[PDB]
Design a protein around this ligand. Structure first.
Ligand SMILES: *[C@@H]1O[C@H](CO)[C@@H](O[C@@H]2O[C@H](CO)[C@@H](O[C@@H]3O[C@H](CO[C@H]4O[C@H](CO[C@H]5O[C@H](CO)[C@@H](O)[C@H](O)[C@@H]5O)[C@@H](O)[C@H](O[C@H]5O[C@H](CO)[C@@H](O)[C@H](O)[C@@H]5O)[C@@H]4O)[C@@H](O)[C@H](O[C@H]4O[C@H](CO)[C@@H](O)[C@H](O)[C@@H]4O[C@H]4O[C@H](CO)[C@@H](O)[C@H](O)[C@@H]4O)[C@@H]3O)[C@H](O)[C@H]2NC(C)=O)[C@H](O)[C@H]1NC(C)=O
Ligand SMILES: *[C@@H]1O[C@H](CO)[C@@H](O[C@@H]2O[C@H](CO)[C@@H](O[C@@H]3O[C@H](CO[C@H]4O[C@H](CO)[C@@H](O)[C@H](O[C@H]5O[C@H](CO)[C@@H](O)[C@H](O)[C@@H]5O)[C@@H]4O)[C@@H](O)[C@H](O[C@H]4O[C@H](CO)[C@@H](O)[C@H](O)[C@@H]4O)[C@@H]3O)[C@H](O)[C@H]2NC(C)=O)[C@H](O)[C@H]1NC(C)=O
Ligand SMILES: *[C@@H]1O[C@H](CO)[C@@H](O[C@@H]2O[C@H](CO)[C@@H](O[C@@H]3O[C@H](CO)[C@@H](O)[C@H](O)[C@@H]3O)[C@H](O)[C@H]2NC(C)=O)[C@H](O)[C@H]1NC(C)=O
Ligand SMILES: *[C@@H]1O[C@H](CO)[C@@H](O[C@@H]2O[C@H](CO)[C@@H](O[C@@H]3O[C@H](CO)[C@@H](O)[C@H](O)[C@@H]3O)[C@H](O)[C@H]2NC(C)=O)[C@H](O)[C@H]1NC(C)=O
Ligand SMILES: *[C@@H]1O[C@H](CO)[C@@H](O[C@@H]2O[C@H](CO)[C@@H](O)[C@H](O)[C@H]2NC(C)=O)[C@H](O)[C@H]1NC(C)=O
Ligand SMILES: *[C@@H]1O[C@H](CO)[C@@H](O)[C@H](O)[C@H]1NC(C)=O
Ligand SMILES: *[C@@H]1O[C@H](CO)[C@@H](O)[C@H](O)[C@H]1NC(C)=O
Ligand SMILES: [Ca+2]
Ligand SMILES: [Ca+2]
Ligand SMILES: [Ca+2]
Ligand SMILES: [Ca+2]
Ligand SMILES: [Ca+2]
Ligand SMILES: [Ca+2]
Lengths: 591, 248
């Protein structure tokens, strides 16, 4: 709810380059945005649309710069016998970063093989650890052709573990059974040799070829990491969207020996169960939870007829090893809710991680929607607390695809709250939404005396002779926050006397100086300090003016932050928390 | 008595070569049988294989020119969807067109049938659907189908728009541009164009396509023999099946 949608940072790249197809952060110092442009023309000799990964800075006005992973053209196997084919290789289709490590891959990279003159899409990745940049193509092996790893498309999805292992998905291995490959980042860089095209890694974890019934499964279509057997080692989660006869599945493998741990199965044909997966602890128990996207799931409408809205299943990892699974349906037909699922970290710093789910083809003009969901002790809040809308219309072949890729859990402006990058490759854009800091308010309301005797006429009304039965309304205001936030918080406080009177009943309590039931007051307070209070006198109408003496007179206090004048040095205006009612009530009684 | 439109949409992979040989006179034989059941029968023809892009298709110059260099045999380069014959009353025109077709690649993977089904349902003027007639779309294949974001492997990430894309040669011109349709997109277009979809598929595909048909209104599935020896009976049975919509 606290993402600033009024003034987000808009980064753009060359048209037609699919700038924003993959997005990530970079925290080696200063921090950066990593954007993939897989259809981008580069300076590589003879390479048409090799693709690139761009490093964009937050501090400066856009100014993105391509990261030179490889400036060379196609290596030759022999004279007039090219070894590889880098044109249209889609480099930057997946970008993944961990500290000073950057992993980018080219899933449509083809090569010749070393046995004959073929053109096989084995996929390749470039890894950049600090200074040294190495290539990583675990599917570019001697196990060639579709039966082997010839069509594996390694790097179709990638991820890092917390113990410096790469997880790579190759959906085409073994006649499109798919494959997960995991290598230690140290062995990848140490054994790299630009004259060796098939490097063997000793600590490699890889799934093996299975029976022909498992062909056409697309294991490795998407990947994610998280611990699921309680041993501290991140385990491998991967969508297998064509498995179970297009019912779709999700495989979980142990991150130590590649043994199968758990399976999930879709429940509807051709819903693409497994298109996207994510793993993050959503209910604050330190057990990572599984999010499985099925963007083509069709649910029942009001008329009983199916409608394609997409579905995300939320699986809470129980301590007993089981899973408590619920399901979250999309809101718009054909919007493909669940196409991307980005863990956001704790977007509002309330102690529970949050997640974003994109419907890249929803909203007006099919400009894309991103839904923000907050976690809590019992799990994921099914109702979204914020809706991020795409602003850029489509004048291209592809729709804007706002939300098709996104990344969270990185505090890029050091304000204490994690932020979110949202890619829109159909319009060649990536957008940074910064989290606004969250104000926790402790308001007070005292009514003394709380029992009101109508015969007790103490105060007199200003300007007349008749006294009234009066009492004091004291309201206190106190605020504080956890992140980086200004001192002066400007509050607008409203008080209404006898708000909960019957429909059409007479207003029984009025303020002394105003003869009005409502009172407004502006309060500039500084956070962390003591509570700022204000006293005021209210009175009852004469006993003959109304009959309801038994209904308690509730004093209602409403307060809102001004937002206008509290902006930070970065222009980031704070916001009140959503879980707390921004009001308080206190009642008084009559004798 | 009610007019009937029939569009024969055939898998043309090399495994359908013997199927082609048996259909050589299906047009005249089918319109003879339909003559008993209706006075206005019109049949047409179209064919499909797959999106002609990597990784669904080998991409060396020679393998593109001849995707059957492994048989070794001469076959046509892989193509997405060709709309050969608009539905017509001339059953002999259906015969000679069938006898002139040639099989393409020897695919043993899922195929791009859903692309053709979408084009057949949507291209009203091109296929020739009559306004007040039963629209029967016979899908003849011995393979599973690709759908939706399967084309993401090929770098095809623009969703199907459900519009007609026949490039004057009556070939699907967005085969390499747009994604395979989703089942929800097919349902949407088949219903709007009143198209009854018949899955005439071989034994290994029957149960799979049965499940697809249970999501698609008006769809039925017939167990096709390996050489399409029973396709005539399957069409009549399916027609008489759809002709009596109990629908509880
Ligand atoms: C708590 O603090 C807030 C602010 O921090 C206080 O709000 C302010 O309250 C005063 C009243 O005390 C208002 O003055 C009155 O304004 C109305 C209409 O105001 C319009 O114009 C504003 C001009 O803003 C300019 O500047 C900004 C940039 O700063 C530009 O962007 C603009 O384009 C303008 O150029 C504008 O700010 C207002 O917008 C507000 O409201 C909209 C919703 O409508 C919001 O979305 C906005 O965010 C913004 O909050 C608004 O458009 C005038 O009509 C008033 O004139 C008469 O009425 C008074 C009584 O209301 C009276 O006292 C005056 O004397 C005056 O004339 C009268 O007196 C004559 C005697 O000389 C009589 O003969 C005559 O008959 C008549 O009766 C008045 O000028 C401020 O605009 C307002 N500002 C904001 C930002 O809210 C709030 O009051 C504080 N509350 C407490 C309890 O302390
Ligand atoms: C999640 O979901 C995944 C996917 O469904 C599950 O992974 C699958 O698990 C099953 C169960 O173990 C695997 O099936 C087994 O495969 C082995 C493979 O053996 C291989 O090597 C043998 C030599 O040691 C060789 O004989 C085998 O040859 C096979 O093929 C020939 C030719 O067709 C055939 O003639 C043989 O009979 C073999 O079938 C093979 O190359 C196999 O040995 C196992 O057989 C035992 O179990 C079956 C019942 O499962 C039983 O009928 C047999 O008699 C024998 O007792 C078994 O078939 C499958 O390979 C996995 N698929 C993958 C990894 O993609 C995973 O388990 C799920 N996890 C959870 C937690 O649920
Ligand atoms: C691959 O590695 C995983 C662990 O990373 C192995 O799982 C482990 O399996 C063993 C035996 O199946 C478990 O040992 C058990 O310990 C409990 C006490 O907790 C004891 O009561 C049992 O009798 C048994 O000895 C072990 O807990 C379990 N590890 C985890 C983290 O769950 C798996 O077996 C390995 N696979 C292969 C093929 O080596
Ligand atoms: C009749 O009404 C009057 C006014 O409403 C009542 O007088 C008020 O009595 C309260 C006691 O509950 C006083 O509050 C006290 O203030 C002192 C000093 O701050 C504080 O130390 C006490 O702890 C208490 O909070 C209040 O000041 C007083 N109001 C005025 C204007 O003097 C009176 O009690 C009513 N008569 C009754 C109930 O018989
Ligand atoms: C990258 O550059 C290539 C040319 O090097 C561009 O390809 C041209 O695209 C147009 C389409 O408008 C074709 O008519 C030309 O024939 C193409 N030329 C070649 C040599 O292939 C391509 O459009 C550029 N793409 C981006 C994203 O910049
Ligand atoms: C105070 O705000 C909450 C929102 O959290 C709302 O439910 C409640 O109705 C408000 N109080 C009154 C008296 O309207
Ligand atoms: C067919 O019917 C549709 C309405 O369903 C109408 O819009 C169209 O013009 C008709 N075409 C012909 C040729 O009758
Ligand atoms: Ca583990
Ligand atoms: Ca959890
Ligand atoms: Ca949170
Ligand atoms: Ca931040
Ligand atoms: Ca076939
Ligand atoms: Ca056959």
């Amino acid at each position: 709810f606290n993402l600033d949608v009024d003034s987000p940072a808009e980064y753009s790249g060359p048209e037609g380059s699919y700038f924003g197809f993959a997005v990530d952060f970079f925290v080696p110092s200063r921090m950066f945005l990593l954007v993939g442009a897989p259809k981008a023309n580069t300076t590589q000799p003879g390479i048409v649309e090799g693709g690139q990964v761009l490093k964009c800075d937050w501090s400066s006005t856009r100014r993105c710069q391509p990261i030179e992973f490889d400036a060379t053209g196609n290596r030759d196997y022999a004279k007039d016998d090219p070894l590889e084919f880098k044109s249209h290789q889609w480099f930057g289709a997946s970008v993944r970063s961990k500290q000073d490590k950057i992993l980018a891959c080219a899933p449509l990279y083809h090569w010749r093989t070393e046995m004959k003159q073929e053109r096989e899409p084995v996929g390749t990745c470039f890894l950049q650890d600090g200074t040294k940049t190495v290539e990583y193509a675990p599917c570019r092996s001697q196990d060639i052709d579709a039966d082997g790893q010839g069509f594996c498309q390694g790097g179709f999805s990638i991820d890092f573990t917390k113990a410096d292992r790469v997880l790579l998905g190759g959906p085409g291995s073994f006649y499109w059974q798919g494959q997960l490959i995991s290598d230690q980042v140290a062995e990848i860089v140490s054994k790299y040799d630009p004259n060796v095209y098939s490097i063997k890694y000793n600590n490699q974890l890889a799934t093996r070829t299975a029976q022909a019934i498992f062909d056409d499964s697309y294991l490795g279509y998407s990947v994610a990491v998280g611990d699921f057997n309680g041993d501290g080692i991140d385990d491998f989660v991967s969508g297998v969207p064509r498995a179970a006869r297009t019912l779709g599945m999700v495989y979980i493998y142990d991150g130590k020996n590649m043994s199968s741990l758990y399976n999930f199965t879709g429940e509807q044909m051709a819903a693409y169960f497994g298109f996207s997966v994510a793993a993050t602890d959503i209910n604050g128990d330190d057990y990572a939870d599984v999010f499985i996207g099925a963007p083509l799931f069709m649910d029942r409408g009001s008329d009983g007829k199916l409608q394609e809205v997409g579905q995300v299943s939320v699986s809470l990892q129980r301590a007993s090893g089981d899973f408590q699974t619920t399901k979250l349906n999309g809101f718009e037909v054909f919007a493909r809710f669940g196409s991307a699922i980005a863990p956001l970290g704790d977007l509002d710093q309330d102690g529970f991680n949050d997640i974003a789910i994109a419907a890249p083809y929803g909203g007006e003009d099919k400009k894309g929607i991103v839904y923000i969901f907050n976690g809590r002790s019992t799990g994921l809040n099914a109702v979204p607390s914020q809706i991020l809308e795409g602003q850029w219309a489509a004048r291209s072949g592809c729709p804007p695809s706002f939300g098709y890729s996104m990344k969270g859990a990185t505090d890029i402006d050091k304000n204490g709250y994690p932020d979110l990058i949202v890619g829109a490759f159909g319009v060649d854009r990536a957008i940074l939404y910064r989290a606004r800091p969250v104000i926790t308010v402790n308001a007070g309301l005292e009514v003394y005396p709380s029992i009101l005797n109508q015969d007790n006429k103490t105060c007199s009304l200003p300007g007349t002779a008749l006294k009234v039965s009066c009492f004091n309304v004291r309201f206190c205001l106190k605020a504080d926050g956890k992140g980086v936030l200004p001192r002066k918080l400007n509050f607008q406080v409203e008080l209404l006397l006898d708000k909960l009177k019957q429909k059409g009943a007479i207003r029984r309590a009025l303020f002394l100086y105003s003869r009005s039931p409502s009172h407004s007051k502006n309060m500039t307070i500084s956070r962390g300090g003591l509570m700022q209070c204000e006293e005021l006198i209210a009175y009852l109408r004469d006993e003959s003016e109304f009959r309801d003496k038994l209904t308690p007179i509730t004093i209602f206090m409403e307060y809102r932050l001004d937002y206008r004048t509290a902006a930070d040095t970065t222009g980031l205006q704070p916001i009140l928390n959503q879980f707390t009612p921004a009001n308080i009530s206190r009642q008084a009684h009559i004798l | 008595d009610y007019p009937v439109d029939l569009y024969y949409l055939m898998d043309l992979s090399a495994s359908m070569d013997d199927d082609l040989n048996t259909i050589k006179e299906l047009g005249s034989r089918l319109s003879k049988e339909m003559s008993k059941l209706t006075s206005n029968f019109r049949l047409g023809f179209g064919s499909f294989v797959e999106k002609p892009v990597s990784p669904f298709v080998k991409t060396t110059p020679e393998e593109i020119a001849n995707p059957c260099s492994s048989i070794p045999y001469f076959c046509l380069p892989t193509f997405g969807f060709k709309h050969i014959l608009p539905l017509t009353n001339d059953a002999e025109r259906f015969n000679e067109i069938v006898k002139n077709q040639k099989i393409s690649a020897n695919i043993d993977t899922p195929e791009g049938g859903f692309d053709a089904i979408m084009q057949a349902a949507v291209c009203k003027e091109k296929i020739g659907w009559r306004n007040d007639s039963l629209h029967l779309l016979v899908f003849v294949s011995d393979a599973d189908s690709h759908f939706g974001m399967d084309s993401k492997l090929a770098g095809i990430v623009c969703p199907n728009d459900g519009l007609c894309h026949l490039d004057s040669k009556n070939e699907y011109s967005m085969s390499t541009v747009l994604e395979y349709p989703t089942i929800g997109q097919l349902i949407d277009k088949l219903v709007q164009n009143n198209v009854l979809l018949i899955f005439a598929v071989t034994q290994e595909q029957v149960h799979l396509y049965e499940n697809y048909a249970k999501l698609i209104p008006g769809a039925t599935v017939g167990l096709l023999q390996k050489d399409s020896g029973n396709i005539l009976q399957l069409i009549i049975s399916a027609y008489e099946e759809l002709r009596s919509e109990v629908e509880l």
